[PDB]
RNA sequence: AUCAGACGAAAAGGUGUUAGUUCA
RNA sequence: UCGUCGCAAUGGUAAUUCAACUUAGUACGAGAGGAACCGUUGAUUCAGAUCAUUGGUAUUUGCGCGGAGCUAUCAUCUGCUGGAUAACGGCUGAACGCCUCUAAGCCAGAAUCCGUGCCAGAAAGCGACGAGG
RNA sequence: AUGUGGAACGGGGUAUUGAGAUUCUUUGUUCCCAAGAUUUG
């Protein structure tokens, strides 16, 4: 208790594996890249 | 449980009556140096007392 | 109760946000002096000397990276001496300290912010 | 002044700082330094998620007052041998480098232009004349030393700075055997090594620095201590303040250069936090001397974005680039 | 990440600078600099600003809550769309700018 | 499910459990994430997601079963990640309204949901659309003050969770289990779960 | 003698002793 | 003679910490009470501080703003750790065939002590090193 | 201390400012220049 390593990834529904343990842009040159897709 | 549960829980370690015969038997060394040791008004009250 | 407090803006006269027939709740004292943003602390009605937990603050409250965020003003939710809301529903924005401070108290708030 | 631990307070002369307790090695541990040289280019605020369990913001992204220090690749170019004996830690002999920079030569010149800069001069010449001097010399370290420490001056050149005389600092090579330490330095004479190479940037940095002079107000000598490294960037690289998240390229350096220092070219480590002294000071990032287990030295950094508003002034952007096409065109 | 646009100076807003405001009409206005947010707080009419690009917008003088499934080649793709919609941008603004000089 | 998360008895509030997927928060305790999950969370992902970093985030969460049409609050990465987190079949949807709280403030029933007296009708119109349960605008924080769900959470006394008047906060009531704090009355919880068909 | 000795808290306590006396 | 880069005789010392939510309504406890426990969030007071970013700035005498930089946790860092022990508790074991923490001894064990770390260094403390006839 | 020399200007950048001006930097110009005395060794 308060040293496990919890991941929110592993609970996933996504159809590529890799993709749900591999981060997203966010914001690019000043622009929000998650909000703008 | 309810009223002598601490009673009834005893009559219901073992190694407490070897370790009092240990005590028991260290008892005459230990009162001579606690009161070779005693100082102040607890050694006077000790001497008194014996 | 719940949460464990954190350095905010002590925004939260309380504004009662809470239904419990005051519209602001001066704070009195502080419980446990000022209340961050979502912290119970005890207030005597100043419209409309009970817990009251900042809903909304008026001055800047830092967020979890370090984004100051100031609300219209230092509105205190009133939360009952045993840590339920007081009123009977909370208004305009509510802190997540709230949440954590009083679970009650944000159930009670409409808007949740 | 209640603290008596740094009372009386005095300023400390050396304005590099200087590690009065190097880390304690052992065979077990590979040949390596223990400190390297850096300099404070800044220290603006980059957010960064926390992965830490328990964390009331786990998973959750932070901003952080991270400090960015100019570290330029350290230059070995000697050795020192110190003989331990029952009155302390003696100086064997010093084996230095056959050639040397004028940086680190000038450091000797108080004016370096006087007469004929002689500087090792003649010490290079029996270097090659005698090389079994050298050898001998290596040999007598070997035998009879246990503390083997490297000389190594400062590429100031690569910095963007004035200051000519290259800094010159006693890092102690650690791990292995004497024999190991001294090859080591030996194979890497009037060489240099990056801080990459000193530390991983996942190591605890317990940095160490003079604090500036106030105006006995400050200029004191000070040890930080539990300070991870973020990111250990490269100067080559120019995406060191473009992170996953921000992958748009930016480098460290953001517009308007660095705050009376300009703009960073070589290497530089991400320390959150702040330390002693002025900016662009010699800092002396160092290996911790405890091995300290804390759960922030565990957690990994994930850096979120690189902070490059404006250096000296203000900027309301990170990066001119992008608010190039963010504003209208400009009347030029 | 969200970069925020600023209410007075129509600006991006980057996490630590600036200043967030929310209203009693849960309306959060967001400043890029001091300036803009003692302008805001003396109620100055954002078209009324030679420097806000909102008067600039409006004078001649210049031109997603569904969620969606994460896919790589999306990314990919949008990567080198953005870029091609700012030097498409960048070319109309500039040619709105030699047309405005004309 | 009378289970409280760590000592909170605010179910409800802690997760807006639905019959799809159980809309729990972050910063709850791990075992009770595991109790929740053991006791309805296969059916209903317990997920634990702090939309807006609050923990009672289940308070507020207007996502029901058939549609995760939660407030505008939510964190847009948060909700991005239980996008990809949860099926694509429910509906997860941002509610952009001045109640952030609006799961507080809609009694979101699957088989009909119940905002708030003055929650917007739009804004209404929309959870109910995506939660496919019939909305009906009716304290103001109806989904806080009494559990919602098509099996059925009866209703606040004006009581779950030893009589509190936050029966939805105390309560997260969902079509596939209606759960509950451990501190639900025993009378209140049986009749909860004969309300509930349970 | 861990408050040596060399220059009243002192009554006592000494599973602290050294020698001896008495009864034994 | 001028420097380089170091050792340390000798002092001083610091962080005091708790507080509140989990870890907990946790084992145990009929139960209440409540461990062990685990991180996080902060905070009482005090110390050295950077001055990046921000607030103030303030002869830029540039244009109220106010650069370049300074001050201000008002932007931020930020305060160590291994043995020996006191009481007490034990092991070994005589005296006092056994027994007996103790008498020869040892271990555990205090917020105690010692060192470690930090701050300095001995203007007359030293070593290696480069450059008077 | 005869040089990628240093420094001052002509400046420019950075920002300030809110169309205008200013001030770390400069393959530009020039000044400066193997820059003199004192002190010991």
Redesign the pocket.
């Given at each position: 208790?308060?040293?496990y390593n919890v991941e929110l990834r592993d609970k996933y529904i996504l159809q590529d594996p890799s993709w749900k343990y591999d981060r997203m842009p966010e914001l690019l040159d000043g622009k929000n890249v998650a909000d703008f897709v | 449980?309810?009223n002598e549960?601490?009673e009834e829980?005893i009559r219901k370690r073992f190694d407490h009556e070897?370790?009092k015969?240990?005590?028991?038997?260290?008892?005459?060394?230990?009162?001579?140096?606690?009161?070779?040791?005693?100082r102040?008004i607890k050694?006077?009250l000790?001497?008194?007392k014996? | 109760?719940?949460?464990?407090?954190?350095?905010?803006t002590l925004g939260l006269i309380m504004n009662c946000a809470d239904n419990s027939g005051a519209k602001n709740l001066y704070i009195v004292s502080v419980f446990?002096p000022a209340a961050s943003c979502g912290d119970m602390v005890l207030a005597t009605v100043k419209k409309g000397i009970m817990p009251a937990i900042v809903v909304r603050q008026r001055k800047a409250w830092?967020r979890?990276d370090?984004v100051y965020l100031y609300f219209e003003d230092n509105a205190g939710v009133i939360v009952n001496p045993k840590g339920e809301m007081k009123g009977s529903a909370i208004t305009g924005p509510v802190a997540k300290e709230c949440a954590?401070?009083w679970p009650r108290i944000a159930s009670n708030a409409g808007t949740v912010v | 002044?209640?603290?008596?631990?740094?009372?009386?307070?005095?300023?400390?002369?050396?304005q590099?700082?200087?590690?009065?307790?190097?880390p304690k090695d052992d065979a077990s541990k590979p040949v390596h330094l223990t400190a390297f040289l850096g300099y404070?280019a800044?220290?603006?605020?980059i957010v960064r998620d926390?992965d830490?369990?328990?964390?009331?913001?786990?998973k959750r992204e932070?901003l952080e007052?991270v400090?960015?220090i100019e570290t330029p690749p350290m230059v070995v170019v000697?050795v020192?041998?110190?003989?331990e004996?029952p009155?302390?830690?003696?100086?064997?002999?010093?084996?230095?480098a056959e050639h040397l920079s004028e940086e680190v030569?000038r450091?000797?010149?108080?004016?370096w232009?006087?007469?004929?800069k002689?500087?090792?001069?003649?010490?290079?010449?029996?270097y090659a004349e005698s090389t079994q001097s050298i050898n001998r010399?290596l040999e007598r370290i070997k035998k009879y030393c246990s503390?083997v420490?490297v000389?190594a001056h400062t590429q100031i050149?690569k910095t963007?700075l004035?200051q000519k005389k290259a800094?010159?600092?006693?890092?102690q090579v650690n791990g292995g055997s004497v024999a190991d330490k001294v090859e080591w330095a030996r194979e890497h004479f009037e060489k240099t090594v990056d801080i990459k190479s000193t530390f991983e940037q996942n190591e605890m940095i317990?940095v160490?620095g003079?604090?500036?002079?106030?105006?006995?107000?400050?200029?004191?000598?000070?040890?930080?201590?539990?300070?991870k490294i973020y990111r250990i960037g490269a100067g080559d690289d120019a995406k060191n303040a473009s992170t996953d998240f921000d992958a748009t390229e930016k480098r460290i350096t953001?517009?308007?250069?660095?705050?009376?220092?300009?703009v960073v070219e070589n290497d530089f480590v991400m320390l959150?936090?702040?330390?002693?002294?002025?900016?662009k000071?010699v800092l002396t990032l160092r290996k911790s001397?405890?091995t300290?287990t804390?759960?922030?030295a565990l957690?990994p950094v994930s850096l979120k974005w690189i902070?490059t508003?404006?250096?000296?002034?203000?900027?309301?952007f990170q990066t001119?680039a992008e608010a190039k096409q963010f504003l209208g065109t400009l009347?030029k | 990440m969200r970069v925020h646009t600023c209410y007075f100076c129509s600006g991006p807003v980057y996490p630590?600078?600036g200043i967030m405001f929310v209203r009693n009409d849960s309306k959060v206005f967001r400043f890029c600099?001091?300036?803009c947010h003692?302008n805001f707080k003396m109620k100055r009419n954002p078209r009324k600003?030679?420097?806000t690009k909102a008067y600039r917008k409006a004078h001649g003088k210049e031109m997603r809550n569904v969620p969606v499934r994460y896919d790589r080649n999306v990314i990919a793709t949008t990567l080198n769309a953005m870029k091609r919609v700012s030097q498409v941008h960048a070319k109309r603004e500039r040619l709105f700018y030699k047309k405005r000089l004309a | 499910l009378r289970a409280?998360?760590?000592?909170?008895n605010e179910i409800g509030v802690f997760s807006n459990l639905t019959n799809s997927y159980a809309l729990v928060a972050l910063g709850?305790?791990?075992?009770?994430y595991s109790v929740f999950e053991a006791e309805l969370g296969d059916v209903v992902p317990v997920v634990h997601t702090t939309i807006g970093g609050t923990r009672i985030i289940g308070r507020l969460t207007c996502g029901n079963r058939k549609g995760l049409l939660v407030p505008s609050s939510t964190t847009d990465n948060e909700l991005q990640h239980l996008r990809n987190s949860l099926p694509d079949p429910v509906k997860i949807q941002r509610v952009d309204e001045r109640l952030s709280a609006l799961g507080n403030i809609v009694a979101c029933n699957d088989y009909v949901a119940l905002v708030h007296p003055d929650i917007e009708r739009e804004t209404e119109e929309i959870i109910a659309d995506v939660l496919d349960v019939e909305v009906f605008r009716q304290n103001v924080l109806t989904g806080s003050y009494c559990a919602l769900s098509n099996q059925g959470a009866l209703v606040h006394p004006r009581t779950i969770n030893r009589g509190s008047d936050v029966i939805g906060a105390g309560l997260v009531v969902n079509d596939w289990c209606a759960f509950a704090g451990?501190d639900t009355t025993a009378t209140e919880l049986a009749v909860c779960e004969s309300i509930f068909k349970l």
């Open positions: 208790a308060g040293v | 449980p309810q549960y601490i829980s070897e370790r015969r240990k005590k028991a038997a260290r008892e005459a060394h230990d009162a001579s140096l606690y009161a070779q040791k005693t102040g050694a006077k000790y001497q008194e014996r | 109760a719940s949460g464990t407090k954190y350095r905010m446990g830092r979890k370090g954590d401070l | 002044h209640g603290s008596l631990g740094f009372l009386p307070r005095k300023r400390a002369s050396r590099r700082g200087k590690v009065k307790a190097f404070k800044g220290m603006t605020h926390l830490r369990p328990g964390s009331k913001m786990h932070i007052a400090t960015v000697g020192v041998g110190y003989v004996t009155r302390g830690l003696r100086s064997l002999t010093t084996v230095w030569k450091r000797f010149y108080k004016n232009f006087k007469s004929k002689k500087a090792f001069t003649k010490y290079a010449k029996k010399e503390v420490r000389l050149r963007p004035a800094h010159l600092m006693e890092i317990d160490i003079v604090t500036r002079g106030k105006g006995n107000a400050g200029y004191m000598h000070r040890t930080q201590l539990n300070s953001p517009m308007g250069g660095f705050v009376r220092y300009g959150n936090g702040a330390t002693p002294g002025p900016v000071r001397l405890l300290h804390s759960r922030k957690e902070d508003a404006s250096k000296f002034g203000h900027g309301r001119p009347k | 630590g600078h600099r001091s300036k003692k600003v030679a420097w | 409280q998360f760590e000592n909170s709850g305790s791990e075992n009770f451990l």
